[PDB]
Design a binder for this molecule. Sequence first.
Ligand SMILES: Cc1cc2nc3c(=O)[nH]c(=O)nc-3n(C[C@H](O)[C@H](O)[C@H](O)COP(=O)(O)OP(=O)(O)OC[C@H]3O[C@@H](n4cnc5c(N)ncnc54)[C@H](O)[C@@H]3O)c2cc1C
Ligand SMILES: Cc1cc2nc3c(=O)[nH]c(=O)nc-3n(C[C@H](O)[C@H](O)[C@H](O)COP(=O)(O)OP(=O)(O)OC[C@H]3O[C@@H](n4cnc5c(N)ncnc54)[C@H](O)[C@@H]3O)c2cc1C
Ligand SMILES: C=CCSCC(=O)O
Ligand SMILES: C=CCSCC(=O)O
Lengths: 393, 391
Amino acid sequence: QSTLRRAITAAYRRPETECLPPLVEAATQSKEIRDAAASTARKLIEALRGKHSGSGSSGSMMGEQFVTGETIREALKRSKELEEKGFSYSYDMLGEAATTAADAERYYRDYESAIHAIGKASAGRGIYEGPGISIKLSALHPRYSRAQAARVMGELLPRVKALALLAKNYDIGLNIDAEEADRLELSLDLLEVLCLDGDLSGWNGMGFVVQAYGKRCPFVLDFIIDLARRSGRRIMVRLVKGAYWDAEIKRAQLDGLADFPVFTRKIHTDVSYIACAAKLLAATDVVFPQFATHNAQTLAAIYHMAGKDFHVGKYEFQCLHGMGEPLYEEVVGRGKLDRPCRIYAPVGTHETLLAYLVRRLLENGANSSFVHRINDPKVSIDELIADPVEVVR
Amino acid sequence: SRPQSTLRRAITAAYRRPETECLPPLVEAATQSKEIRDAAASTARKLIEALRGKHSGSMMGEQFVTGETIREALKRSKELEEKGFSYSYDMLGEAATTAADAERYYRDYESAIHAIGKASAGRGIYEGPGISIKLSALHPRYSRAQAARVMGELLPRVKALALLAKNYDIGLNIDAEEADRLELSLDLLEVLCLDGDLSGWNGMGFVVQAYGKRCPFVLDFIIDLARRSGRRIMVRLVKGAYWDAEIKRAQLDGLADFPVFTRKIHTDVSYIACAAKLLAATDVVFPQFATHNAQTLAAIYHMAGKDFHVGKYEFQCLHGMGEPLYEEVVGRGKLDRPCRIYAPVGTHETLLAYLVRRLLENGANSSFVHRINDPKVSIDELIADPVEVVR
Ligand SMILES: Cc1cc2nc3c(=O)[nH]c(=O)nc-3n(C[C@H](O)[C@H](O)[C@H](O)COP(=O)(O)OP(=O)(O)OC[C@H]3O[C@@H](n4cnc5c(N)ncnc54)[C@H](O)[C@@H]3O)c2cc1C
Ligand SMILES: Cc1cc2nc3c(=O)[nH]c(=O)nc-3n(C[C@H](O)[C@H](O)[C@H](O)COP(=O)(O)OP(=O)(O)OC[C@H]3O[C@@H](n4cnc5c(N)ncnc54)[C@H](O)[C@@H]3O)c2cc1C
Ligand SMILES: C=CCSCC(=O)O
Ligand SMILES: C=CCSCC(=O)O
């Protein structure tokens, strides 16, 4: 318990109207930055609309567009082409929400075998230039959402620590994906224990996702930035909007709550994301920000907010396999923006793919999504480059 | 005793009966003769080889919607109607969260019935188009409010819609939704079938989900209701669209035994057993066999025997999924059996929930429509009778 932890708990269901003013202020950019971001965003979107990206490119319900390979060996082999273009990878062994001990055990073995393969393929490239892995805590505990948080974390900790130690041995990144809002606190407690565990000293590969659609986002970030500074671990922080919005709304509508744990207007999430990006960019000494987005306006805003100084390891962008390549082909490389992007790369069979595909459908099919609007003949470029702070009303 | 005590008790007793206890009667009821199984395998093999042959061997789901408005969807239906297909239109929208949303869905259904009835032009309930409705669209708290309150506000609304459908002589089908609303929807069906204001019209329809343990006992109740009401009830037999959600709900409810089967081939056996029940009651119900599975279709086609006329039974499929299969079914040179296309009408504001269920259907490794495109799955496996796996 701390003042920083108290701010997280206090924001859980803070009224949406009260959350917004501080985010609006922090997300407000100077005129020069806004003008430069508009120019960059226009250039990117014109390039995108000469392509055929977005929801129209999502492929068939077989989900072939979204999976990098069936096995880690297959996915690693297929990664060489984009790696020399300036992309990196974070591999996701598909599988989540284990319901039996056998399933949780299988997912653990999958993650463990992937770390060995990824770590050997990394070949000493380290946590920024080389590949990493992403895990879901719900894969590793058979009653992750339906058991007491204290006991869940206590059985989960040895498994996650063992995986982190393997990642340290090979010096690769290991990211904890963010899932449902009611599990933020548990996963954050796990992150704290790991960052204070002396067995993991000298390794900066521990990573953690924070969801900007959540009202707690800036306060989670303050806690993580402070944890990094005091632990000496340069935590990799993946800033995302969030993948479970429809489910969070449905659960909140059934819990009879007046105030949800997530925002309810998409523009509020966009303001939240930019405000939280400003917080992360002011903390690159102690954290490694990873800006996961397919929205060219969001990207261009962050690109200019970061300033002129850049080196590999300062920050990166990220995208999902099968969704982000058209945009980021206009970003990576010395002929573009010369900023790196890490591809989140699902690995598994068609069975383990289904739950992930449903979230990709809700993301690609929503009229509010950038990837849908980029292909919408009714949506102008002027609208696509609008600054969320200047639009909110 | 209470009216229909024996039939109603059998439904309640099956609700969460252990899966192993549900299956043996269904397996025996779904067992067909070797001669029928050989003929069905030949038919299924032909259907599958045609499926690929005419189709060279989309997640955003524009192919799942027939039109943005009922006028648009009706215009786009002429081509397939001329071939021998019929339609059931679905105004997209469900799970109304406010009384105003429910009123808006009601008005969409009312206007659609006028338009569909005009287009029907007296073709009747079998050859002409119909409508499908979801009760969750018509009550603002459908999954949550007590059945007494839901019934008292829902019944006048559904009765008014049924009266318009009667006035145009079109079909009106109540779609089946989550398992916890089966009982309410069935009580509503009974009151409507016994309502004299709807006399003379056989267009009332009702879905039963074969993935549910109550399915054969619900069918018993419906067939008996048809006999005592004098209505020939249209009965759409489906497997079911909410399986993933039912499993998650039952886990969250703490249940030791779920209201649905957990082995996919058990749902297939249930479907075939229930088809045998419906095919023996065509005097009092109109069976509508909704499936995209060529093996299920072939089994029912041969189970039904050589005697057929339009109005005896039909098949059904979803727009954007079933047309390739049923183009090998409708028509004198094919199987000479009719098919009604379930045709969603709406926009993105109402497409999400339906599209998610389509993705869970199309993307599941256990689904026929996925297995037909899976290089690991032989034609032998696609045509195999699942009843022989558990017999
Ligand atoms: C590499 C990568 C990793 C990711 N990891 C995770 C993870 O671990 N956990 C996680 O939850 N998400 C994660 N995501 C985010 C998620 O999968 C989506 O890709 C992301 O939210 C889409 O944002 P965008 O900026 O690309 O698009 P945009 O179109 O700009 O934003 C869409 C997002 O806005 C939000 N939204 C939509 N409607 C509303 C509304 N009415 N009110 C409020 N918010 C709304 C949702 O978050 C939606 O995804 C990750 C994304 C990437 C690219
Ligand atoms: C015209 C039409 C109308 C329909 N109306 C409705 C309706 O009102 N309500 C409704 O709920 N459904 C309805 N459905 C059914 C649903 O939408 C699917 O289309 C149907 O269940 C798929 O069955 P299939 O025989 O085509 O495919 P198959 O691949 O043979 O069967 C797949 C089905 O098996 C079941 N299943 C999958 N995995 C398991 C498992 N592990 N254990 C048990 N069962 C499993 C599910 O029902 C799944 O849909 C309708 C279908 C059609 C064609
Ligand atoms: C794509 C994001 C990574 S975590 C949530 C999901 O898997 O959708
Ligand atoms: C497609 C079937 C009719 S009812 C369940 C759904 O809408 O998916």
